[PDB]
Each structure stands twice: as structure tokens, then as C-alpha cells.
């Protein structure tokens, strides 16, 4: 299962030279200092790195890279990618259902999980909890082991692996190891990037290539860097560790004729002959929906006390507006209750939905490397994530809310004037953090996506309509209260609820308004504030929420589209 | 703008009471808000409550349940019902009409004389 | 601003007949237009608050109608000295905006 | 400069054992697993932990731990503790103008500078920036030189130090160990304990302590763990580095014999006889405060692009809001126009205040490394860091707000009711930033600490007295009123600005009112929301607030005073 | 509440004496005091509304004075259909409070 | 109350204009806004700005600070100065007076014919 690659000149400006070296089944490996060239050679030459930047030809086995490659390739991350609130059995199961042909059945799919599960021996936990942050099951040890399975369902001849032991003290660190030892020949051609091993585990590499500041050193096999270097003129420390002992060479012991000293060895010629001897998706979009929502749904319930714990405090928020609007009478503090207790509704739909931003920033490094993958499609995975994570998180806050609230407070006592209520905190919601995804859809640190949408949020409730009368704005300001979403809410909730309301004891203004600078009903509160009467006037703002809906999720999926997967 | 009083007036304690004022020369439905002043023997009035002319109320706070103010509005009435009478309040109760736009109870009955006695 | 206008800007009615006036709005007013008469030489002087009252020192032929956007006055068998152009004029925005009135043509 | 520790049984529940052995001058080690008593050894070992829990004997050259140990102690903290944003030179005259006597002269404290900063090679760098996060003069290799030398200054004879090299790779690893062979035997014993260690640098320890799972298992010379565990019966990996064929035998290849293996050795009598042989502040309080504000201004001057920038936000927000509410004139609109800019500047006030709460959680590290160390004491500390960050950060966006919006508005034009506002907005900054202090000021990690003051604040400003008319809360819900800050500033605000206005053109009600639903004064306005006339009724709002000042730095002071300091 | 009180709970005055009578108010009012005169047997009419107006049916000689809490009826030499208990009553917060009211000695 | 309205009955453009419009029998800065309603020749009304009681003035936004309107309280006046005059303004300006609580302009004065010409 050889790998044969040649002339990797990659571009970003360089960050490689022109590579050459032929990498045969066993376990070949990749020493390298911390960050020369080492991750970046493993990278483009596991199909992972943009073609433009690459300017030579690798092979497999005498075929120049088919178009389903990755199909056939493993390549398993550093850091932990697993989703720890599930439970292996299940990830494994969900790296199988979308990764490999659907035309086989359900049974003989549990049966390659429980080949493989033996195969890297896991039956010892083989149902139990990951974890992330509030429940920890089992260690980094099975976590590399799991990670390492979630990508031998497929069974690839070509196990592109980096940096396995990097986190992993001494014990797990030689079982992983062994591990891949065993493993590997039942016909499986390894290639990771180690930093700094043991000599322990330098017993059998078959290969490895020590190469830094973007160029090639040496690719012989194991038992030959010791003679190599013996021949370029070192004791290496007569008890030591040769592994850290090319490194301590590299570092200061220069460099552009170190590199030198080795095309004119044996092994360049060696393996350059056979070189240029050799010069000369799968499912539909159905499942890729339907698991990806099983996967966030199940996913969102393993760590509970992330979510569950607003939906206390929600309810906790709504307990305590109920008792303090309690009354709402119908005289002069009317008003001020009514406009108060509908606007905090709508800024706290609002200022609550910036915590639904990590829906794509926690997972961008699970994403990409799935998307690399081909498991799905990205109109799939931003589906599945919608209705499973915005949809059943954004529906309930606006249902403790207006139930709750609704006849403690004693609004309007219709039936379609409560569904409405309902149905205009629904769609703020809905609103808002969407507008949320459109900003956060493409980073990966959150710190100045929640500044931004903080501070975008705070002008809109600005332009919200209660802090400011929006009939007398100068005429050039005007035109900014159409990006608010707070208005659009807080204008529907008000034209819902004081319409047919008399706020002044006494005196029957429906006739005529005597003195003429009372307020003294609902409609001329609601006129005075630059609201419309006709029923147009309040769905209005419903046409209007369900367009920056739409707006604010083609931006996201624009975003996840245009993103750079490399 | 022009109310007559009339009802019961003895009680015993414990039992309730109604008094039923009937409004004339104007539909208590149309403008004003409706009050219940009533006076103790020692005069002192107290306030007791109103009755709005679309139909909500608010009582003086004072009176916890103990009054409640409804209206007939076919034949333009507006009743008071007090429960649980203590043998204390043995007021006059005067029918009073708000205003609303000018504040004042501006019109007044012409007072029973409730007392609260075996 | 609110743009009052009264479409039928001229009439020709005789010594009777109960005339009516419309003063469209072009926003929502809230029962706060108030109609003036002027005469052909002199003030407009008022004549209706609120769109309903009316001003001591005039008939009760004259009374206003409408809520919302649509009012209208309505004069009752007209008289002889109730000639001359009616402006409404909204007192609800800020810049108070008359209309354009409307003569009367004695047949 | 020997070291002779005895049975150091530290129960916190052990973590570990009746250890023996002495650290003779040279440079004694402490080899150790990951986690299993090294560092908590080396804690122990330097008067760092609560001597509550340890129940042994340690000894000093003979003598049982004077009282001003650390007076004559270097331990020098793993991780970095300099300040980025100061430069070398002047950290290490912050080092000197602390903790060694000022009653020598300024010329002698820095020719001893110069003396340091050559005896540990630097004047390489000798005025460099170290920076952070924004700028980065220096590299890792003289941050930890640096650290090294900051308690090099007092000159003791027992460096105390926790591992040296972990985040360094080879050539300044291999530096700064070099480094401390040299300055070793100028007569200072360091015990330093370092983390799976080369062979290059296991030349010369004259000790090493393999101690692991609480209990000691060798502590003879370095030339010396080699012989005892050959007699132990192990080949060691002809070829290897014996540094990690220790970890190699203690992981997996148990335990109750191996550590028992060692005591019939000969090397615990060795020790042993001589261990049952030898059986038988300083400154004022003024320099700790005119230093500590020195530094934590010039830091703060630092790294201006955290500061900085949220003046730049302020002066942004000043002037937009000044384009907003320009008109404020007197009509109708005027009473929610001003009720809405007031409302909005003191509610800003405070949530921009909840940025200050890293003021002491960044820095719990430092000044808890500090504090142990004879620095300073904590009042000193206290006093300084808010006469230097708090003070004149809050001061500022009091008056950019106040004197950039007050002209623009146009509110109410005299002196005295213009320099009201302006100190009634920095009462309610200090007041509400004293009370993010409050509640953050023990915490290391931040993320709660926000949580609980942002609802914090979201519930005061409920209870703020613009969505609700606080005469209309129920009675046993309107004493919760006094606890909130917004209520205390916007209410001083509000009648500062509210009191000789008329709301109602072409009405003059202030002989009186007409049809008495009109607000058509400023003084209805203030008395329907319940609030004073009285001068009394402004001024009572500030005695409240320079009373949550006191109480809300006291109770931090105290959450300072009470913190476990080990 | 607001409890409105009269200190002098009883006075004696003679025929022409200029009288005033004291209603201080126990919060702030801002000219919403107004006036009762109950007679021996009747419903106390209303005297004096927002504190500073009459009421068409009265004399001239009754006036309102003060402001924020010291409200002041002034009868001015009071004639003999003068006698009888007088009320404030504000009428500012939800539950209206009377006062104890000064019944009126004739020498 | 008793308004009357006089001044130059003619300018030429760009200069300026005053009208001092006595008002008689009620102090200017006791109760009402005053204003200065003007009328064109086609018999169109225009607003043009008023002087509240207190001092404050609020002028009809089609007239950008070319009007500007002040008060001698001493004598109880009101003046309107016009400045840059165009020659199509040949309006009549009947200095008319708010009321607030009730909303209308009750009295007017009697109006001057300005002409705009050379
Ligand atoms: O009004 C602000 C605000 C402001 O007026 C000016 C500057 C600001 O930085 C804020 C602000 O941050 C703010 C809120 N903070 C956002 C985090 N809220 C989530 C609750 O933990 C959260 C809420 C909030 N107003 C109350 C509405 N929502 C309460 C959150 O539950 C604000
Ligand atoms: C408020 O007053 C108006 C009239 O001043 C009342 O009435 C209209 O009233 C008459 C008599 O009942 C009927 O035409 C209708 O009831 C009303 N029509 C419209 C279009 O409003 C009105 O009823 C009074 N308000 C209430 C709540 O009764
Ligand atoms: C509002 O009206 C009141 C009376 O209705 C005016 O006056 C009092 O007015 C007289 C006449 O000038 C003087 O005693 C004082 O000027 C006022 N005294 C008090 C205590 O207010 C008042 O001037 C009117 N408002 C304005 C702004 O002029």
C-alpha cells in the first residue's frame, strides 16, 4: 500500500521544498522539530491542504490521487474530536452511518462495530460515557483509542495519522502504540508525525523523516538514522535517546548546507530511482439530516446543565415579572407597566439568544474535519443543526414566558391575542439569533463576535421605541429604525395589547378626548408612538421578521459555504 | 348628575348588605366613574371603592373582599355589597360620582343610615 | 408632517340644504381637527374643537363627525350668513397643517 | 547550605509519607511522575503550604525555620509571573523596591542591578519590552531568565524553584540549566523539580528525589540511581536516557514493595544517621503603596489597547447618542426623551462596569505568589491597585458622557445642575464597579463571576424605575427597591434634570393643574414615580451610594484578608 | 396612603372674621387638594378644586392657597350660611383620604 | 385675548422683516403660546412658529432660521423677524394665539398684506 510521493513544493511564500521519499506499509512516521515542516508535510500529503499551494505529484500504488480518495484515507485529528455527551458504541456508530455505503444492511454494520471494537480492544467501556465537562466516564486513553476506531469502519489502506502522543503520559502512550504496532499489519500503512518519542517506542518505525525548516533531512528507515548520522560524524550521546538526539542537531547543535549533506548520501539516489522508475456525497440528503439531528438532539441532551439550566432560569425570570406586575390596573401607572413588561419581553428574547452563537464555534474544528471527510453536505449539516439545536431551544423561552406571565399580569383576555403574544416572541427569537448565526457563523474565537452582536443589540434596543419617541428623530436618523429587531417585536407585542384599553378612570375618551394631552386610551398611546391601527399595521411586523429570518440564514449558510475548508 | 339612595337600613353582623343607587339623568355606562363614600358617626368619611362606567372597579384597600361593587346597567343601577359586617361600621354611605377629567366627586346622594346591630 | 386635504375644494348649495364637508387626514389625527370659518375680508374664526364640540356664539346646526382619518362637518340647512371657505386645520403633530377650504356658491 | 527535611507526613488525606534525606549545595533535583508528590514535595519543602497540614520537622542549616525564611528564599513560580507590559529593567527595580531593605540608597539597589543582571546574562536585553498580548519584545528564553532573576535581587542561599524547563524546547532548555550549574556554586542550593528531563542536561545533580504516589523511593547522588537499581535488577535499555527509565519502571513496568525495597538500602541509613544527628513587613506602608500604583499605572499604560479602546467606545457612544436625542424639546415627546437618555447612560454606567472584574482575577497568581513571598501587605495592595486601575479608568467615561452629551441634548443649562450629572455618573460607575469587585474578587476563573453580575445587574435595572412604576409593586416586593444601584443613580439623575420644566406647551399648570391626567410638569413626573422634592431628595441618593461604596470595597477587602494564601 | 390632616380641628370665629383653615398633607400632593363644606345633615357639596379654583354657586370671598404640602382654605369674613364642617380630600394617589374636618363656632 | 397686528407694509427681497403684533388685556407670559399664522394670496394657511408663555419657541420646519420670533415682556409684545425675504411670500400674518388646554387658536389678530417687491 504504498504512498510515493515526489516534488511536494508547496506555496502558501513557501512552507516545503522539493520532498521526495516513498512511504511503504509498516508504520512510517514523521520526527521533525515542533513546527517546521513536520504537520505541514503530514497535511498535504493527506489531501488536506488547498491543490493551489501544491505544485508536484504524489501517487498511491501507481494512481495520481483518485477523486474519491478520502473515502479510502483515515485521518484522525490531534485533539479529541469525538463528541464526548455521547457514548462510543454510538459514535462509532454515527462515523458509520454516514460515512460508508448504505446500500448493506443495519446488521452487518453492528457487525464491523464489534470487528472493530475487538480489533482495538474497547469492549472493556464499549457503552460508556465520554464526557466533555460535566461527566468524565473514561480517560484520554480510550479517547485516542475511540478516535482512532471512529475511522476504521470505512477500513482505508492508508491510516493518515497526527501527533497521536501528544497529551498521552508514558502507560496509555506505549499501549497506543502497540496498538498501531499490531495493527498495522494486517496491511495498513500508518504515516504520523510524532514529537519527540522515546526510544522505547522507537523499536519499529520502518521509516520516519526528519525534516525541518521546509526541507527534507532524511528518509531511510528506522535502523539507518543512527548510521546516517554515524557516517555525518556524531557520537549521539552514547546513552541517550537518538530521537531527541537529531533534534539537539537541529536546533543548535547550519542548516543550509545540513540539508545538503544528504542528497549526496545514498538514500536520496536510493529511493529517487524507484521515484521516477513510477514516473514512468455517497448517501442522499435524507440521512445526512436525519442523523445529524440525532447526533445534536442526543448531544444536547448528554450535557444538561448547559441548556436545562436557562430554561430554570427563565422560568425563574418569568415567576418574578408575574409578581411584580401583578395588578396592571387601568389608570395612569397603566401605561408605564404595559410599555415596561412588553419591552423587557422582547430585549430579553433579544439579549438571550447571544448565548446561541457556540451552536457553530464550538464545533468549527468538528465541522471542517467532517466536511473534509466526505460524511455530508453543508446545507445538510446546517439543516440537521437548525432543527435540532435553534429550533427546540429558541421554542420553549417563548412558551414559559407567555404562559406564564400572561394571566398573572392580566393582559388582553382573548384567545388569538394570547397566541399572537405567543407567536411575536417566537419569532423574535427565531429572529435574533439568527441574526446571532450570521455573525458568528465563521470564527473560532468568541470574544469579539459576542462584543459585536452586544453592541448591535444594544443600538436596536436603542431604536427599540421606548427610549426614544421615533416621530421625532431628525429626518436623516430616521431610516436606522428599520434594522431593529427589537422594534419590530416590541411594536407587534404593543399593537396587540393596547388597543382596546381605557387608561383613564373616568372619563370616556372614545367619544372625544377632552384636554387633549392625556393619553387617555390605548389607540392614542399607540398612534402618539408612530405605531399603525389598521390589522396590517401588526402583521407587518411579522412579514418583517420572517424576512430577516430568511436574510440572516442564507448570510450563515453563505458563510459555511465560502469558508475556507483548508 | 342625579342619584337617589336607597336600601335596608338595618343588618346584623356577619350577614351582607345592598344599597342600590339608582343613577337618573345620565347612563352610568357613558362617562363617569361611580364611587361609595360612606361616613362614620363621628364624621369621618371614608372612601370605599368606585365602579368605572365601562365596568372595572378598585376598592379601598382598607376593604380586603369585604366590599364588592356590580351594576345593572338595564335599569342604569350600581349596587354595593359588603360581607361579613362587623357591628363597627355603622356609617352613611352617599352615593358618590366621580369625574374623571376634573377629579372631584361633584355629585353626591342622599345617604342611608346602614346600622349594624341585633 | 399630515398633509389635510378636503377633496371637494368648492360647493354650490342653496338656502337649505344640509351640506357636508370632508376633510381626509393623512395620518391618524385622533378626533384633534378643528374647523375655522373664514369669511371673504376678516379671520378665520373657530368654529368646532375636537372635531365634535362646538364654540359658544354658533348654532347647532353645525357639528363634526368621523374618527380616525375621515372627518367631516356637516352644516344643516344653511343660512344666508354662512357663506365663506372652511379650513380644517389637525392640532395633533407639531407643524399644524390647515387644508385648503372650500368655498360656497350660493345658487 | 544544607536543607535537612525529616518526616514530612502532609495530610490535607494524606499526600504523602515519612520522606527522609537532605539537599546539600549543588543543584538538588526532584524527578517525580506527572502529579504524584514531586511538586507537592517541593510545595512542602519551601514554605508554601499551611503548616496545619504538615506534621514533621524541617531543618535549616540546623536551625528550625527562622520566622523571615522567605526574606532569605527565592521560589521562583513555574509558569510566568513578570509583568509583559513592564520592561525588564524596571521589573527588576519593582523586585528590589519591595522586598529588600530601603535603608540602603537608590545607587547601591541599582549597581546591584547591573551586578544581577550580569551575573544571569541580560544585558542582551537589558531594557527590552516583555509584553503579553499585543507586543512580544522578548521570547520565552528570557522570560524565564527574568523570572529566574526577580528574586535574585535579595540575594538568598536556598533558590527554591518548580520546573524550570516546561514549555522550553532544547537550546534555551539546555541554556538556562547550563546557566544554573554556573550560578549554582557561587554557594546556592536549588532544589528544583524538573519533568521527564534529558540525559545532556542529568550531567551534574549531586541529588535527585524519585518520589512518586506520595511515598520516596530514591535519594542518593546522581551518579547513583543508576547503581541502585542495577542492584535493583534491571538493564535500563543499554541505550536510553535512565531520566525516563525511572517513569519507565513506576508507571507499568507494584507499589507497596517497590517503596519498601529502599529502606533496607543503604542509602536510607546513609542519610538517616546524620538526620537523627543533627535531631540532637519589612518596609512602610507608604513604599507599598507608591509602588504598587507605579507599576500597575505603567502596566496599565502597557497594553493601552484594552483600556484605551473602550474610551474610544465611549466617546463613539457620546457622540452618536448626542445625535439621537439632539431636539429634547418640550413637548409631549420631551418627558420620554429625557426619561430615556438619563435611563440609558446610568444603566450603561453599569453594565460597562462589569468589565472591570478582571482587575484582580488576572492577576490572583501574581498577587498570591506575592503576598506569600514578604512583599507586601494586602491593604497596601488593596489601596494601590484601586488608586491605580479603578480611580482613573472610571473617572474618565463620567466625562466624556457628561460633557459631550450635556451641550448636544441641551438639558437643563446652570453650573451646579451640570456638575450634578457629572458626579452622580461617577458615583454610580464607582458604586456599581466596587460591587463587580465585590463579587469577583477571590475567584480565579471568570466565567460565573460574570454570569452572577450581569443578572445582577439586569435585575436592579428591572427594579430601576422605568419599566415599572415603583409605587405599584406589591408591599411585600417594594423593599427589595434599596438594593439597586440603577434606582440610586437614575433617580438622582431624574431629579436633578426634571424639576423646573414644562411639559405641555401653551399649558401653564404650575399654578395649576387642568383635567389632572397630563404630567404636564416636571414635578408630576417626579412625584408619580415616586421620588422626593425635598433637596434632601437628591442628596439621599449619593449618602446611598457612598455607602455601597464603603461596604462594597470592605466586603472585598475582606474576601482579599480571608483567602487561603497557599 | 396620604394621610391629610387639619390641626385645628375645631375653631371659633365671629361674623366677619377673615378665617383660614390649615390641611397639611402627609406626602406630596402638587395642587390636588380640594375642599368640602358639609352642612348639619346634608352630602358634603364640593368648595374648591386642584386648590386654587371655585366653583360656580359660591361666593368670591373662599380661595386656595399653598403648594406642595401646606394647603390653606381663606374664608373671607364669613356670613352666616358659613357654618359646618369642612374636608379636604386629595385626590392624588388611588385611595382618596378626607381629613378630620373643623366644624365652625359662631361666638 | 385681545390681539392687534401692525408694521411695514412693504420690504424688498433679501432684507428683513418685523411685524410686533401688541397683544392687550392678558400678560403674554401668564397662560398661552402665541403664534403667527400667515395666509398666502391663493388663500392657502401656513403655520410660522409660536413663542410659548415661559420664553421657548418652536418655528414651522419649512422655515429654516429665517424666522425667529421674540417678546419685549415689558410692554407685552411679540415680534416676528423674517429674514431673507423672497419676493413670493406676499402673505398676510394675522398673529394668531394657542390656548394648549384645549388646542385651537381662539383669538387672531387682523392681519398686515407684506409685499415682497422691489
Ligand atoms: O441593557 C443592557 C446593556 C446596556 O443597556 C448597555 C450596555 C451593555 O453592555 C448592556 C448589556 O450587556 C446588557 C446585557 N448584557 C448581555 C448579557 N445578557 C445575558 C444574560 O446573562 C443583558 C441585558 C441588558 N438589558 C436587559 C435585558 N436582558 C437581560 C439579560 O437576561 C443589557
Ligand atoms: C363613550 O361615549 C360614547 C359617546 O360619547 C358612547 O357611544 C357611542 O355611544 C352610543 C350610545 O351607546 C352608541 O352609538 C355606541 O355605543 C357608541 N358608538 C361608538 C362608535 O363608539 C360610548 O358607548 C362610550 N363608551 C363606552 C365604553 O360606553
Ligand atoms: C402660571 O400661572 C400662575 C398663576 O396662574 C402665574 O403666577 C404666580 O403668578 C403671579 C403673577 O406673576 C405671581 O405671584 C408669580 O409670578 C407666580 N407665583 C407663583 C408662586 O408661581 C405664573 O407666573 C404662571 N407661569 C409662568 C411661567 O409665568
Redesign the interface.
Known sequence: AVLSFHNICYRVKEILSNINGIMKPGLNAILGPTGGGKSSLLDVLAARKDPSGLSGDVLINGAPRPANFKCNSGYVVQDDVVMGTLTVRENLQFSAALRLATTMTNHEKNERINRVIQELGLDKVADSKVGTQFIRGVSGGERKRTSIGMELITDPSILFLDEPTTGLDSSTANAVLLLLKRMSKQGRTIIFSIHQPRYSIFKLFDSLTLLASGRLMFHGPAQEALGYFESAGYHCEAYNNPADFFLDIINGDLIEKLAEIYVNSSFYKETKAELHQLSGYTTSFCHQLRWVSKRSFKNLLGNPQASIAQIIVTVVLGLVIGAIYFGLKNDSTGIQNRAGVLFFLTTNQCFSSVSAVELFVVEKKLFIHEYISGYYRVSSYFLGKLLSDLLPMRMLPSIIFTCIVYFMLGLKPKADAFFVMMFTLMMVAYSASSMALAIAAGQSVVSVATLLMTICFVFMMIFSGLLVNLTTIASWLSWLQYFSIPRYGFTALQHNEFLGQNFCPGLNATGNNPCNYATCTGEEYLVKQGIDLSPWGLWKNHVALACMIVIFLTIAYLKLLFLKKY | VQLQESGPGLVKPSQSLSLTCTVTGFSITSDYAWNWIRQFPGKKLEWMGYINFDGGTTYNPSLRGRISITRDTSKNQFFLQLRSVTPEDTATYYCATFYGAKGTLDYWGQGTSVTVSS | ?IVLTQSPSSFSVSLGDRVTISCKAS??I???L?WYQ?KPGN????LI?????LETGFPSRFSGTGS?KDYTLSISSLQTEDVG?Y?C?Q?WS?????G??TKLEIR
Request: proline fraction near 7%; charged fraction near 10%; aromatic fraction near 18%.
Open positions: 408632517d395620518g391618524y385622533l378626533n384633534r378643528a373664514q379671520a378665520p374664526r373657530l374643537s375636537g372635531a365634535t364640540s380616525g371657505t379650513y386645520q392640532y407639531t407643524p399644524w397643517t390647515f385648503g377650504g
